[PDB]
Write a protein that binds this ligand. Sequence first.
Ligand SMILES: [Mg+2]
Lengths: 115, 113, 114
Amino acid sequence: PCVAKFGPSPSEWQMASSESCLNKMSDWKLRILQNGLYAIYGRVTPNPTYKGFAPFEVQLCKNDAIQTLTDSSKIQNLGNIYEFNAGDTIELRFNSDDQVLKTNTYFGIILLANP
Amino acid sequence: PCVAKFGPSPSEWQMASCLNKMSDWKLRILQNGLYAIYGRVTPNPTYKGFAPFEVQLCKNKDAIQTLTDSSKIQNLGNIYEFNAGDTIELRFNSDDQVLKTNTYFGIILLANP
Amino acid sequence: PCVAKFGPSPSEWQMSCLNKMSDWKLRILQNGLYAIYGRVTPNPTYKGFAPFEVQLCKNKDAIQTLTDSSKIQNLGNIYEFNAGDTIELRFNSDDQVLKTNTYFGIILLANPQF
Ligand SMILES: [Mg+2]
């Protein structure tokens, strides 16, 4: 049962696994250590009162954005399923940290299977 | 597996814990965990009512999925974190908006660390 | 683990609960909840007559339809399938995709007994 989750604030990385399918590298960024099928989950809650000159863009990145969010008027789900390979780096990136509400913004991942 | 599925008509609740059926289309989550939702929503071509087409999967009273295109047969497959005490329900602006024989939803626990 | 994966080219099938029938097409032999995953990449120099359209079909029913030709698209999802069901990834024209970066896979997650 290999599962990891970053957020929401004030929480950082939580993790449970055997000995393990991933490695946490830094905030919002992990490293896949086992080829297999994974599920991503989580929530991006945009900041309504963002007062910055940068365009709202949240991306989930595989090394390649595999999920791009450009609508700052909607709370967005990150739930999905992907095949990843050992070595891959998974990262949730924000064009500015102030674009999202970090107290209601998290993402996680779980190994579903390894063919 | 901890699994529950409602519909399609004439089937009601089927179950194989982590949840408790509350009524038609509505469930109570009993454990914090990671869940997969699956299912399909088929608009009813015979609908002539005056309420706009809308179907929503609500966690508690908040929509986590919203369907407004009455010309789409939409899949409900997704992954979510739910907590104990959450209710999950599929709601319709009108029962006559969907073909009940072709509309169902299910949920399975993936893990609950 | 009951898995099958077609592609990407030149790979075809990599691999009971299912039977592979043809390129991009398989026969579900067992009831269950299945996860689909994969990727569809449009061919940016397609100039055929058919409108772009790629579909995951269960029997006669497109469970997923893609009509956006400007972006690579992910196929990840969970569906309930039944013994007998066929599953195929079909293209309105094979020129519409770059087979070198188009593939799909499936795996049985559970087969609950209600
Ligand atoms: Mg061949």
